[PDB]
Homo-oligomer: A and B are copies of this chain.
């Protein structure tokens, strides 16, 4: 009946969404071992609270890529949001701007960069999927710059491969591809370029001046390469545990990637973040911020824009209370010594 926390939206969404759709949303890869881990691993990290600290004034605002935001909790890119709620990306963009945070727009969105940008003022990032036809990629990137998007998140952990048993609602299209020259179900399928390599990151930088974030890094080895090749940030991710099963939980991999980057570029994380305590734990391990994926689609399905705003609020309030109880007045005061990781 009443939603006291983020995970509850999942039950409500499950009630109102067709089984096929809910299963598609919640699903991980294969055995779904990592899906569970992305969540479970946060509970193997304990707090080491500090006492006798004046926690009367808590400040959780931060600067991401130069942009000042209200909290280190942002929205990850989840494709075709209008399938969860007719408002779709419009609802999400408005909730994000209202909350004073960042929203990342998927390439497979049901609303174009300009439709989203029309909703109003707000900092947004554009998620890029590189197609074989570079011509289409260039068109998408310039279009994002024009629409006012602040950075490009290049997804590199794209899962491979229901579809034949489902029929999409009418008029739902991949709007970002409407206008640029290339059912819509297919075609876009074998369009993802699996030959993508670091040289392509170099090329991307020649067509745009926007910061390029590499989304899908879980090893210290690739983190170094990200820095060496000029990426502006790294997003420790395993695509919500939908790409390959038995890879570690992103929160387990975070520290090694943060270490490897050596403070050169900000490291972000997604995968399993549901509570304010999870946010604190990620920041204590070195992350500059976190992205949430699934909670966004579940709350959108549940209460639309109101649901998305509630998720962000609940997470903010929980994160604020966690800081007060741990003895932290600002993000700068959250230290690695404020938690005791499973390997500590």
Contact = CB atoms under 8 A, between A and B. Distances in A.
Interface of A: 33, 43, 45-56, 156-157, 160, 194-198, 200-201, 214, 216-219, 221-222, 225, 243-244, 246-248, 277, 321-322, 324-326, 337, 340
B50 A160 contact: no
Contacts of A340: 248
Given A47-B247, A247-B46, A324-B160, A200 B277 contact: no
24 contacts: A43-B246, A46-B247, A47-B247, A48-B219, A48-B247, A48-B248, A49-B218, A51-B156, A51-B157, A51-B216, A51-B217, A51-B222, A52-B156, A52-B200, A52-B214, A52-B222, A54-B197, A55-B194, A55-B195, A160-B325, A221-B337, A244-B325, A244-B326, A246-B277
Contacts of A325: 160, 243-244
A54 B194 contact: yes
A213 to B, nearest CB: 13
A337 B256 CA distance: 14
A46 B241 CA distance: 13
Contacts of A337: 221
Contacts of A33: 43
A195 B47 contact: no
Contacts of A214: 51-52
Contact of A221 (B50, B198, B248): B50
A47 B282 CA distance: 21
Given A216-B51, A218-B48, A222-B51, A56 B195 contact: yes
Contacts of A51: 156-157, 214, 216-217, 222
Contact of A47 (B52, B200, B246, B277): B246
Contacts of A201: 52
Given A248-B340, A340-B248, A198 B243 contact: no
Instruction: Please name the 8 residue pairs, one residue from A and one from B, whose CB atoms are nearest each other, closest first.
Output: A51-B156, A54-B195, A244-B325, A56-B195, A47-B247, A52-B197, A52-B198, A48-B219
Given A46-B247, A160-B324, A218-B49, A56 B225 contact: no
A48 B244 CA distance: 10
Contacts of A321: 160
A157 B33 CA distance: 34
Contacts of A47: 244, 246-247
Contacts of A55: 194-195
Given A51-B216, A52-B201, A160-B325, 10 more contacts: A45-B246, A48-B248, A50-B221, A50-B222, A52-B196, A52-B198, A52-B200, A52-B214, A221-B337, A244-B326
Contacts of A218: 48-49
Contact of A49 (B160, B200, B244): B244
A321 B244 CA distance: 10
A301 B224 CA distance: 51
Nearest to A339: B246
Given A244-B325, A246-B277, A324-B160, A49 B219 contact: yes
